[PDB]
Short mmCIF file of C-alpha atoms in Angstrom, two decimals:
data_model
loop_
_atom_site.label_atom_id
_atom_site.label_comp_id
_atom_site.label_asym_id
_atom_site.label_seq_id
_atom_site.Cartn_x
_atom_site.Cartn_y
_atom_site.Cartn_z
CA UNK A 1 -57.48 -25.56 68.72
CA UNK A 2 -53.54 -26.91 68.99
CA UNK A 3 -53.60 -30.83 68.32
CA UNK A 4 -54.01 -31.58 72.00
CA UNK A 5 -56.76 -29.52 72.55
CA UNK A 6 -58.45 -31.45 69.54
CA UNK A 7 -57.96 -34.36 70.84
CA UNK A 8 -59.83 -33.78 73.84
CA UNK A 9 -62.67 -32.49 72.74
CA UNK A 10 -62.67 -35.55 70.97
CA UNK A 11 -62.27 -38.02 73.50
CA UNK A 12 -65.65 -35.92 74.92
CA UNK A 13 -67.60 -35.99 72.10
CA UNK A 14 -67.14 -39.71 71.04
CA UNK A 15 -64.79 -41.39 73.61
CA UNK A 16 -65.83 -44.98 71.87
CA UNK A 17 -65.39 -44.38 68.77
CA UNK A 18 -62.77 -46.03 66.40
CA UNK A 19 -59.71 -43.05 66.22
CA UNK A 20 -56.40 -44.89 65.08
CA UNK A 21 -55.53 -48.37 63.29
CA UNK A 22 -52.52 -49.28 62.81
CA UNK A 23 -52.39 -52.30 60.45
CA UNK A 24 -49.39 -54.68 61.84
CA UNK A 25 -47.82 -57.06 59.38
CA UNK A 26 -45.07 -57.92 61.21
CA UNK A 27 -46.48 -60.64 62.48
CA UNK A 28 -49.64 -61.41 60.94
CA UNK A 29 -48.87 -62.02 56.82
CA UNK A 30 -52.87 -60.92 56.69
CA UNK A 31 -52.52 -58.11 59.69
CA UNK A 32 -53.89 -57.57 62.96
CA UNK A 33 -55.29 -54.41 63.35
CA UNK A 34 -54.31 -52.61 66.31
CA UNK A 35 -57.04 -49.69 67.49
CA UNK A 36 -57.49 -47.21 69.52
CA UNK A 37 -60.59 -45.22 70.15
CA UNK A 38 -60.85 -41.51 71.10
CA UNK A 39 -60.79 -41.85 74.73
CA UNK A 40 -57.72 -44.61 75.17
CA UNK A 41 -55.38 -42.19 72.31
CA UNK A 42 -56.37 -39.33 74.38
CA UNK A 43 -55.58 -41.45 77.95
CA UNK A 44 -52.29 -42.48 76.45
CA UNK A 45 -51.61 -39.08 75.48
CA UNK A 46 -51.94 -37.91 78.76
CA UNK A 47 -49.98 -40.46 80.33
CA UNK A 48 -46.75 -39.66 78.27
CA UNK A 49 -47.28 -36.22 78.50
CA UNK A 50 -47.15 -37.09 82.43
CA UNK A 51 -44.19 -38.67 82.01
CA UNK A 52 -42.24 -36.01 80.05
CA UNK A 53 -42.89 -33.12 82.49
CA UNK A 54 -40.29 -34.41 84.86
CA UNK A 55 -37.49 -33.98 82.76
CA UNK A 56 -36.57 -30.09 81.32
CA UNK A 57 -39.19 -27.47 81.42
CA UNK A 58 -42.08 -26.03 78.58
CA UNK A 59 -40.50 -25.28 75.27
CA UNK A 60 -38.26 -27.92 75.47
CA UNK A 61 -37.41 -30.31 72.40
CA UNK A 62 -38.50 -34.58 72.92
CA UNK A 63 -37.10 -36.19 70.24
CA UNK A 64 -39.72 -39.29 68.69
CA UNK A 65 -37.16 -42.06 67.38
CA UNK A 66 -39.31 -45.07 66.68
CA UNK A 67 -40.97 -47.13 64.24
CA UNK A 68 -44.37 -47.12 62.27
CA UNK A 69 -46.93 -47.26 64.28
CA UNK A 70 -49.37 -46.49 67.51
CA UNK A 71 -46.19 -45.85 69.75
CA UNK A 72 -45.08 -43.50 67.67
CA UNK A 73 -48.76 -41.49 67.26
CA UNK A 74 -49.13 -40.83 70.85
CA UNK A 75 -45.42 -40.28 71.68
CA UNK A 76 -46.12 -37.03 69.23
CA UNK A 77 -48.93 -35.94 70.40
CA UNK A 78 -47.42 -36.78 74.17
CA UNK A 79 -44.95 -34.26 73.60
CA UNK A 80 -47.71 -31.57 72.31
CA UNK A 81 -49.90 -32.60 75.21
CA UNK A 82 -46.57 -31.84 77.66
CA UNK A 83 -45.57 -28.13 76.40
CA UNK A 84 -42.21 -30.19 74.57
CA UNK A 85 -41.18 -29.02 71.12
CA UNK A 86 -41.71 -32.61 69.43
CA UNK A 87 -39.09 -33.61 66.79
CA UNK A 88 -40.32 -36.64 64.54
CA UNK A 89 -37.34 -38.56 63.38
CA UNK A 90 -36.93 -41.65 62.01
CA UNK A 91 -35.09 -45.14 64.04
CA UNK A 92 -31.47 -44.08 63.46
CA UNK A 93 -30.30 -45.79 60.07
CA UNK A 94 -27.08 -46.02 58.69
CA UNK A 95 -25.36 -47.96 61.34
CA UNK A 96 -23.44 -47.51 64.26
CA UNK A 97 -20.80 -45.15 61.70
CA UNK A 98 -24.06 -42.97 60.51
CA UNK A 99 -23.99 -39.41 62.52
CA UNK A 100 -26.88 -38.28 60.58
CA UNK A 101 -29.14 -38.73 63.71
CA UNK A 102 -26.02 -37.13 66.24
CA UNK A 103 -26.33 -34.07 63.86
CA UNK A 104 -29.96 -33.46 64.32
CA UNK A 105 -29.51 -34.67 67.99
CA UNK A 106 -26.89 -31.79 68.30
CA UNK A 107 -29.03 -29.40 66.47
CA UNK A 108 -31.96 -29.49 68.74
CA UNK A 109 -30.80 -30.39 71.99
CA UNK A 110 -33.39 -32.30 73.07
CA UNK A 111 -34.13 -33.15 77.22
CA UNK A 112 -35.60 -36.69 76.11
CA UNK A 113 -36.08 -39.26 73.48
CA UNK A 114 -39.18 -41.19 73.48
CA UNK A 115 -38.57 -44.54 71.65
CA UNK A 116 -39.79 -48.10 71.94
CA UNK A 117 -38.25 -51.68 73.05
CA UNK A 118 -37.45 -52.63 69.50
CA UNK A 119 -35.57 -49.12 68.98
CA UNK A 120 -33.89 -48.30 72.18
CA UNK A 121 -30.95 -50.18 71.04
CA UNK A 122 -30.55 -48.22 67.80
CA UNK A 123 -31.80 -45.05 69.49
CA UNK A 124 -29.20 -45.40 72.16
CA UNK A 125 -25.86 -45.58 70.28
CA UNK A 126 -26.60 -42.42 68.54
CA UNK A 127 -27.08 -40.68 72.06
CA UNK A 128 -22.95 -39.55 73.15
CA UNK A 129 -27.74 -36.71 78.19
CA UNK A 130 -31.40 -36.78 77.36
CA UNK A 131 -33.24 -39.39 78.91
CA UNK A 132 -34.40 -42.15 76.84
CA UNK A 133 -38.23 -43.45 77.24
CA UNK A 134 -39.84 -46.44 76.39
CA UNK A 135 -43.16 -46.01 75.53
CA UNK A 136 -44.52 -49.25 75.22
CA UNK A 137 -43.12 -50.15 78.00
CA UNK A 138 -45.47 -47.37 80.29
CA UNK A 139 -48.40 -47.96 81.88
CA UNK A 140 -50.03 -46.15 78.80
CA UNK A 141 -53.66 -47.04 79.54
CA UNK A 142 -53.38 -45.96 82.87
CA UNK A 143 -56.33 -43.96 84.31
CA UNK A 144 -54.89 -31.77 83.83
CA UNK A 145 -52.62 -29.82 82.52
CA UNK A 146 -50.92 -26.48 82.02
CA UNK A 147 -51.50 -25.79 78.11
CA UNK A 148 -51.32 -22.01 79.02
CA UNK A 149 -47.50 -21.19 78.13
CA UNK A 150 -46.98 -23.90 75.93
CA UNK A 151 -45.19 -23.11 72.56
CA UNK A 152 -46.44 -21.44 69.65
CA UNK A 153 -43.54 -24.24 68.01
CA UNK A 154 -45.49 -27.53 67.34
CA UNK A 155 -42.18 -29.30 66.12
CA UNK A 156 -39.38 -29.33 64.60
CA UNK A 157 -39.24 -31.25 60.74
CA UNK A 158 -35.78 -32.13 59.47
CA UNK A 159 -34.67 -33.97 56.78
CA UNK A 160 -29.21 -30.37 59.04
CA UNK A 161 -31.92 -27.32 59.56
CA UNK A 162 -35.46 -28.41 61.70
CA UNK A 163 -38.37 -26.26 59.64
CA UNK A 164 -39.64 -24.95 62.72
CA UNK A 165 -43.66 -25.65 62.42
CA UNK A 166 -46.46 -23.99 64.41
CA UNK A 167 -49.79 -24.81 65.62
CA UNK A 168 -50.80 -22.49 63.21
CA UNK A 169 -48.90 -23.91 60.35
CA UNK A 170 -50.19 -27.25 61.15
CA UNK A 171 -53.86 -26.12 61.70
CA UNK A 172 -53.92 -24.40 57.95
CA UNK A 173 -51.97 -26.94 56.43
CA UNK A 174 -54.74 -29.41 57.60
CA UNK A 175 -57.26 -26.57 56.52
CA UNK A 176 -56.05 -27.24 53.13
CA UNK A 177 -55.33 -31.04 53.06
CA UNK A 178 -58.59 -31.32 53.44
CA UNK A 179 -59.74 -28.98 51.26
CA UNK A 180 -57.89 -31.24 48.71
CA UNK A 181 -59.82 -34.42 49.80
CA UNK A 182 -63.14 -32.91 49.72
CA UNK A 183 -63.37 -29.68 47.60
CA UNK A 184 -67.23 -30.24 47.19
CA UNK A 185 -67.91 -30.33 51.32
CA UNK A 186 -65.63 -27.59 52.65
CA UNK A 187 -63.40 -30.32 53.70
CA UNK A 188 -65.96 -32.32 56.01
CA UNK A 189 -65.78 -36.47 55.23
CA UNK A 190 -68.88 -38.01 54.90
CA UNK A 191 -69.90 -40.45 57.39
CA UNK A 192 -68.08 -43.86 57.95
CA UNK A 193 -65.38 -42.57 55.66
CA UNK A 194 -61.46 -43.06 57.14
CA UNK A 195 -58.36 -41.85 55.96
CA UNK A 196 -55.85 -44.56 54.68
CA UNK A 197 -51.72 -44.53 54.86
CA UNK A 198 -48.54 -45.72 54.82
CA UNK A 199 -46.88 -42.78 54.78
CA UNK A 200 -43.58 -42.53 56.82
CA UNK A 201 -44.60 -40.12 59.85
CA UNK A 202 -41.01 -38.94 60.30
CA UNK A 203 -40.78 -36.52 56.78
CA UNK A 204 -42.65 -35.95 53.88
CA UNK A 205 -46.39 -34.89 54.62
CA UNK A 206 -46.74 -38.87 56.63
CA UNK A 207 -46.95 -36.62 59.83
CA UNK A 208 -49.72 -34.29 58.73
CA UNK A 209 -51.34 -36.32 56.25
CA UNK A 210 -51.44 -39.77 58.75
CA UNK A 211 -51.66 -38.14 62.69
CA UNK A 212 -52.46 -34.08 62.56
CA UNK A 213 -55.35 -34.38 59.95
CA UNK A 214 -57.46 -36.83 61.43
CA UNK A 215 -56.85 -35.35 64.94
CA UNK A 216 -58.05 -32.12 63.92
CA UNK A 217 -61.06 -33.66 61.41
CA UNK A 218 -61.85 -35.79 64.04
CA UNK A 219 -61.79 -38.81 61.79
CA UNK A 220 -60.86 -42.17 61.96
CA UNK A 221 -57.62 -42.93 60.52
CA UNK A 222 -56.50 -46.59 59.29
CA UNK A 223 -51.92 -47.00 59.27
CA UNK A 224 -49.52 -49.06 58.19
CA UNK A 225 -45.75 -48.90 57.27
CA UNK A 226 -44.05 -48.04 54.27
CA UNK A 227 -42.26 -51.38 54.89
CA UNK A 228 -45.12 -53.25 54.66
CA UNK A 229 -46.41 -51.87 51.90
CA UNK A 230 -43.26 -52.31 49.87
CA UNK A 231 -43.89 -55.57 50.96
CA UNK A 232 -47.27 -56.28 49.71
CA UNK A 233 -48.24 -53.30 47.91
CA UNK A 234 -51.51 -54.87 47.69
CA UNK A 235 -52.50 -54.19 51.43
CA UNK A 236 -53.04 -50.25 50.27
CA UNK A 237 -55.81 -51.78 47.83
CA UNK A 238 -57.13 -54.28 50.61
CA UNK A 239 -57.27 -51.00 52.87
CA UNK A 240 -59.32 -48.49 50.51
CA UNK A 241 -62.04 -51.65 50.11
CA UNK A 242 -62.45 -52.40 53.51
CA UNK A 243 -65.90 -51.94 55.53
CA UNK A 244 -65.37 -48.37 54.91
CA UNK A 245 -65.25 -45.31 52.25
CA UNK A 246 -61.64 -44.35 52.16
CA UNK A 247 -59.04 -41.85 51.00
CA UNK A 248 -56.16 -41.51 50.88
CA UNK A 249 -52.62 -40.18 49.94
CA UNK A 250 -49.42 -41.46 47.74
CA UNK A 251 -46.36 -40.60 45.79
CA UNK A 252 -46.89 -40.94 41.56
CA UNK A 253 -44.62 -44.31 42.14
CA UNK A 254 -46.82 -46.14 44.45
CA UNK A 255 -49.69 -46.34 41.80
CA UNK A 256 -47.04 -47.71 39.72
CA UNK A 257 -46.30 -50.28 42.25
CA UNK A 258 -49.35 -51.29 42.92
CA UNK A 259 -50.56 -51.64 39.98
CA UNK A 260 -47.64 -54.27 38.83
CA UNK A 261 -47.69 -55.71 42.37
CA UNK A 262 -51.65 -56.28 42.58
CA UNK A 263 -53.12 -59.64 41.26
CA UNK A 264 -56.32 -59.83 40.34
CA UNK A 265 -56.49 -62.63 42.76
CA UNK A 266 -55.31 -60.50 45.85
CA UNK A 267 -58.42 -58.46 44.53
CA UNK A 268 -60.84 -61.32 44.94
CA UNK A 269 -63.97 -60.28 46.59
CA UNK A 270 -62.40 -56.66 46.50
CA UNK A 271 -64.75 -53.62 45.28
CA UNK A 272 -63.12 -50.12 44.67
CA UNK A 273 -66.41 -48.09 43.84
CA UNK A 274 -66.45 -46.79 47.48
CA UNK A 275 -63.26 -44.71 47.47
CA UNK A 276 -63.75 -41.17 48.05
CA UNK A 277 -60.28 -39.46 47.05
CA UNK A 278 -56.53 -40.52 46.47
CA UNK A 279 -54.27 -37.77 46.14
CA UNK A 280 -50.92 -38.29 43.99
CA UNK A 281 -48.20 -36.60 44.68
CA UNK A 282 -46.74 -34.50 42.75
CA UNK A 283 -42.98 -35.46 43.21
CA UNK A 284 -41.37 -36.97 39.97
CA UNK A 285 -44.60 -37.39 38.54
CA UNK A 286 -45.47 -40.04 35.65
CA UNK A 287 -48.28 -38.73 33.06
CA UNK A 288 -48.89 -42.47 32.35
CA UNK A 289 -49.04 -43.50 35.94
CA UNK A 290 -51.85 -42.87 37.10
CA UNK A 291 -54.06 -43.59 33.80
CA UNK A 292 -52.49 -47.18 33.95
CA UNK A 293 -53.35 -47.44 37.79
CA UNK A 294 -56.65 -46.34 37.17
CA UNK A 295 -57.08 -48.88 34.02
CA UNK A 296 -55.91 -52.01 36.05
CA UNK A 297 -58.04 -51.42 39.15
CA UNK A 298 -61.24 -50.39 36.50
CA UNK A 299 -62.19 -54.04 36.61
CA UNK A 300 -62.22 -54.18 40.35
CA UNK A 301 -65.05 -50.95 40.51
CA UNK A 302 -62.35 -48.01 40.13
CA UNK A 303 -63.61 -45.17 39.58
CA UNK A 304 -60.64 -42.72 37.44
CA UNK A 305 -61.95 -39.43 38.79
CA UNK A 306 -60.92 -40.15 42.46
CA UNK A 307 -57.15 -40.14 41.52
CA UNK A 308 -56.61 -36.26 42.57
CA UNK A 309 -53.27 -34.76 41.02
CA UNK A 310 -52.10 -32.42 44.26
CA UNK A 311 -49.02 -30.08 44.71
CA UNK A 312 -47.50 -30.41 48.31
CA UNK A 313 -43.83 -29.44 49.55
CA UNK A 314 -42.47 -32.46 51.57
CA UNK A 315 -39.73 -30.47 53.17
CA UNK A 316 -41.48 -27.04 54.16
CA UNK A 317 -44.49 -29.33 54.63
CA UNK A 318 -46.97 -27.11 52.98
CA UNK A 319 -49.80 -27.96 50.78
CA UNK A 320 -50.28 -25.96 47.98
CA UNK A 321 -52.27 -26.63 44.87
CA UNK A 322 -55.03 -29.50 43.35
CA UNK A 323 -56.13 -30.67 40.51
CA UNK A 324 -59.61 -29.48 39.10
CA UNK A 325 -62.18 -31.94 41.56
CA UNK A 326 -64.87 -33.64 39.50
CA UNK A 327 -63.15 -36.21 37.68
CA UNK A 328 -59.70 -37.11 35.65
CA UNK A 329 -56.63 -34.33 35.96
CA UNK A 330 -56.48 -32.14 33.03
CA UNK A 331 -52.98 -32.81 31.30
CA UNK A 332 -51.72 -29.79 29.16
CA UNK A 333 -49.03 -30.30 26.56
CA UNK A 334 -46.28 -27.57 25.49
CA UNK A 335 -43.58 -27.03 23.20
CA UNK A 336 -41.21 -28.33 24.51
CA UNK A 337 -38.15 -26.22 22.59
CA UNK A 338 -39.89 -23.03 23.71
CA UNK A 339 -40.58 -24.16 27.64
CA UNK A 340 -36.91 -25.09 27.55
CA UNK A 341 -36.30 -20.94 26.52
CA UNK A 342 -38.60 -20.12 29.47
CA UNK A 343 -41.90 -19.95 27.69
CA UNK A 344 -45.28 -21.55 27.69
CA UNK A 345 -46.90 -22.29 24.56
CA UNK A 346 -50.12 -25.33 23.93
CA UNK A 347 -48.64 -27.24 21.01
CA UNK A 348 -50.18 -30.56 22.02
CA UNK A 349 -48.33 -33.15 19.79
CA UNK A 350 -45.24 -35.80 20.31
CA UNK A 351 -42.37 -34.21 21.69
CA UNK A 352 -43.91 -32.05 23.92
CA UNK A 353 -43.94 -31.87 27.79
CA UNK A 354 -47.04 -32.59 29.32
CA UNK A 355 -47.77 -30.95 32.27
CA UNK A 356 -50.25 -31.37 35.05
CA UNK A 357 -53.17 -28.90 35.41
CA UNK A 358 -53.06 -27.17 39.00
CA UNK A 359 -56.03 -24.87 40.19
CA UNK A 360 -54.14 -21.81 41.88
CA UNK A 361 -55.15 -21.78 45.82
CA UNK A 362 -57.13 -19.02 47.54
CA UNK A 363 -54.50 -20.47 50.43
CA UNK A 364 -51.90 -20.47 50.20
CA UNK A 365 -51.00 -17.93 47.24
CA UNK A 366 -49.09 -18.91 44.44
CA UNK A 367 -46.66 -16.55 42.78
CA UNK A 368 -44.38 -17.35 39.19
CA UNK A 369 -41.47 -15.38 39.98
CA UNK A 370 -37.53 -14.32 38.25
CA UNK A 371 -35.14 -16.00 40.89
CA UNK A 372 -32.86 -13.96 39.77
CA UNK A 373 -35.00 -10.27 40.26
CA UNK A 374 -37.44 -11.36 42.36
CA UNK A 375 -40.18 -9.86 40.17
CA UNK A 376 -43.06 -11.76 38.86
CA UNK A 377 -43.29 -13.10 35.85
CA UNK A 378 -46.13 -12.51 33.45
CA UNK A 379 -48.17 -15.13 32.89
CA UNK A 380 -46.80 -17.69 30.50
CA UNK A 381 -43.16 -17.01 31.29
CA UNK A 382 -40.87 -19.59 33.66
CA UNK A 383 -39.84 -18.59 36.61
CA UNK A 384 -39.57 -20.11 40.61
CA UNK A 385 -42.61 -20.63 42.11
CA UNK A 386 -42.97 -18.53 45.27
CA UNK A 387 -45.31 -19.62 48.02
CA UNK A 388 -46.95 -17.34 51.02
CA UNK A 389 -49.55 -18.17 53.40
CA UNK A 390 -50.12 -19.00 56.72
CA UNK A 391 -49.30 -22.91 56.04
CA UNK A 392 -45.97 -21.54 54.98
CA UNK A 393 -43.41 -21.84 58.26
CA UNK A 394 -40.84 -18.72 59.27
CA UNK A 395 -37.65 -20.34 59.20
CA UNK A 396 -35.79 -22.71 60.49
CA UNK A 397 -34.56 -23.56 64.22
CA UNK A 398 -31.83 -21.14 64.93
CA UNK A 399 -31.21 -20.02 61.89
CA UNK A 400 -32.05 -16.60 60.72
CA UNK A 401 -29.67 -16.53 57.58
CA UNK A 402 -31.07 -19.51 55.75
CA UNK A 403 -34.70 -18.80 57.41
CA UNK A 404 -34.41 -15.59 55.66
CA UNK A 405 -33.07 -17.16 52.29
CA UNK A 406 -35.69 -19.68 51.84
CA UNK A 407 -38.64 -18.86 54.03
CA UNK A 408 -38.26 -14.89 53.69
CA UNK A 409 -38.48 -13.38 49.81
CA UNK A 410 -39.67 -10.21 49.38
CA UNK A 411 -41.34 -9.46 45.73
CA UNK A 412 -39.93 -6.56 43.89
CA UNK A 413 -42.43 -3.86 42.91
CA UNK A 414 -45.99 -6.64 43.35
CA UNK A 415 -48.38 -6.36 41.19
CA UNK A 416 -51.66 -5.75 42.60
CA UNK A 417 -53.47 -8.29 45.25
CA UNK A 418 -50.18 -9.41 45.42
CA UNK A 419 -47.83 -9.28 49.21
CA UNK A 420 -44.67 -7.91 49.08
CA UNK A 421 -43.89 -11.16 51.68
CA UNK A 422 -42.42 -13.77 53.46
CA UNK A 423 -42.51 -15.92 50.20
CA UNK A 424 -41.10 -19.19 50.33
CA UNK A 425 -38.75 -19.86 47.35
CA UNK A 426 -39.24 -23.94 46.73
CA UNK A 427 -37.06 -24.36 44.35
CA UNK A 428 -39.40 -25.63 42.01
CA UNK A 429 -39.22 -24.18 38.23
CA UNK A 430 -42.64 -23.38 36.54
CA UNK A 431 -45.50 -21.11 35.25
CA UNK A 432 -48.95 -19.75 35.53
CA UNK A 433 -51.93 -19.32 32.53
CA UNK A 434 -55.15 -18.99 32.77
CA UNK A 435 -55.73 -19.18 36.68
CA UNK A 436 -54.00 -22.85 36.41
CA UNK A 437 -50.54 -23.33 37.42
CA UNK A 438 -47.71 -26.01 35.90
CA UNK A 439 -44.78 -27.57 37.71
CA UNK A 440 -41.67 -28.18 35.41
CA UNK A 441 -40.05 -29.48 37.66
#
């Protein structure tokens, strides 16, 4: 059920279909839409898994170095495909003086580096070896393999530690994604429905959310690149009122973005009523965001209760928590005085902190707990929240100490229904009343 196993049953049951668009901008102001259907991903796939099994051996690390885009999609899954422990990086930034790529070069010893023509340059003064691949430049469409030893490790995500991901990880992590997209369906999208994003794929849930989900869901997915959204912010609205019913994914500042950046003449002949689900992120969150998104679009068919508030961990990559689904987030205010002391109390007024309301998951579990006792706190008191599930990784790539610091807490006396462990501490302040959960911050 590992990625590349899903991806051939796909290319089985609907080798025509649409699979993967990227949306290029780089050349085309309007974009040209670059697609791939089940059957040619899958044929790629193979052909750079083909090529990576002549250098090192199964369990090996293949670095992905390379921009936005379709390269970069079946360069992943290539490695999977191969038995390689895939790490998704970024093109090396920072310049020539930047060892931030050398670090996490060093750290997982990689046998090869798949990259593409525009990269290589970049790619290759970071590399002081492993052999450096060019994937557009392979015979990628070109018309069996062992998959029976292969890694439990799906990759490696840095940020210099590599959370070391599984298939498992991955699998529940999409279990839940999509949970969060579709609460009402068991996570199943609806018929000519496509995921939209412009997520980075090298950190931050743009791997999962953009390549593993739709692989797994077997649903068509439609790309671009943060850079071209920054760009033209409009393009995400273009996207989600296209010929199909989309959802999608994005930090609290992107609805800020595009709502300031969207005219309602870039909207022209644009209807929003078909959108399915966005889910906002709940990283520096803006209570005012998304209401104002919501209110700008409104005249374009916008419908408010598709804006899904959802709690996800870019670095451990693990989704956690949404919103009630149905319609608009529920937005609690507290004291803020007393919430500063630790403790949660309603007064809705001026001053206050308003806080997000999160449904607690069934998966993973969410525990309020003292940092400094590593007992749980009673509901309505601050504390860390504590994460455990099987979406939650074991540690990081050789390196038991901080593994066991971060991915390995062990609850003091539980309370009942409750694991003693491995909790993840995320380092996220916040508390727990009646079966909803708050981020602080």
């Amino acid at each position: 059920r590992s990625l590349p196993a899903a991806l051939r049953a796909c290319a089985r049951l609907q080798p025509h279909d649409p699979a993967f668009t990227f949306m290029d901008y780089e050349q085309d102001w309007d974009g040209v839409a670059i697609t791939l259907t089940w059957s040619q991903l899958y044929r790629r796939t193979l052909n750079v898994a083909q090529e990576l099994s002549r250098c090192g051996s199964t369990g090996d690390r293949v670095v992905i170095s390379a921009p936005q885009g379709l390269e970069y999609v079946v360069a992943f899954l290539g490695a999977l495909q191969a038995g390689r422990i895939a790490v998704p990086l970024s093109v090396p930034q920072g310049g020539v003086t930047d060892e931030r790529s050398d670090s996490v070069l060093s750290d997982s010893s990689p046998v090869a580096i798949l990259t593409t023509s525009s990269a290589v340059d970049d790619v290759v003064q970071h590399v002081a070896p492993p052999s450096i691949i060019e994937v557009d430049l392979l015979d990628l469409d070109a018309p069996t393999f062992k998959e029976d030893e292969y890694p439990s490790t799906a990759y490696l995500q840095y940020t210099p530690a590599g959370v070391v991901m599984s298939h498992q990880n991955v699998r529940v992590n999409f279990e839940q994604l999509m949970s969060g997209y579709f609460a009402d369906t068991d996570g199943i999208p609806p018929p000519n429905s496509a995921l939209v994003s412009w997520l980075p794929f090298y950190h931050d849930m743009g791997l999962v959310i953009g390549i593993c989900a739709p692989i797994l869901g077997g649903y068509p997915a439609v790309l671009t690149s943060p850079v071209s959204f920054l760009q033209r912010p409009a393009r995400w609205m273009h996207l989600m009122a296209s010929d199909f019913h989309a959802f999608s994914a994005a930090p609290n500042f992107a609805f800020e973005l595009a709502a300031r950046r969207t005219t309602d003449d870039d909207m022209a002949g644009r209807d929003l009523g078909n959108i399915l689900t966005i889910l906002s992120g709940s990283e520096r969150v803006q209570a005012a965001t998304i209401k104002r998104f919501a209110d700008r679009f409104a005249r374009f068919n916008l419908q408010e209760r598709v804006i899904r508030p959802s709690y996800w961990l870019a670095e451990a990559t693990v989704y956690v928590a949404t919103s009630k689904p149905g319609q608009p987030p529920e937005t609690v205010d507290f004291d803020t005085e007393s919430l500063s002391a630790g403790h949660a109390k309603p007064c809705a007024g001026g001053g206050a902190t308003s806080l997000i309301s999160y449904m607690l998951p069934r998966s993973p579990i969410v525990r309020i707990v003292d940092s400094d006792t590593c007992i749980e706190c009673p509901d309505g008191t601050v504390g860390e929240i504590w994460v455990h599930g099987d979406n939650v990784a074991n540690g990081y790539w050789q390196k038991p100490d901080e593994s066991e610091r971060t991915f390995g807490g062990k609850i003091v006396t539980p309370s009942p229904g409750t694991p003693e462990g491995p909790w993840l501490r995320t380092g996220d302040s916040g508390f727990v009343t009646d079966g909803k959960m708050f981020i602080i911050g």
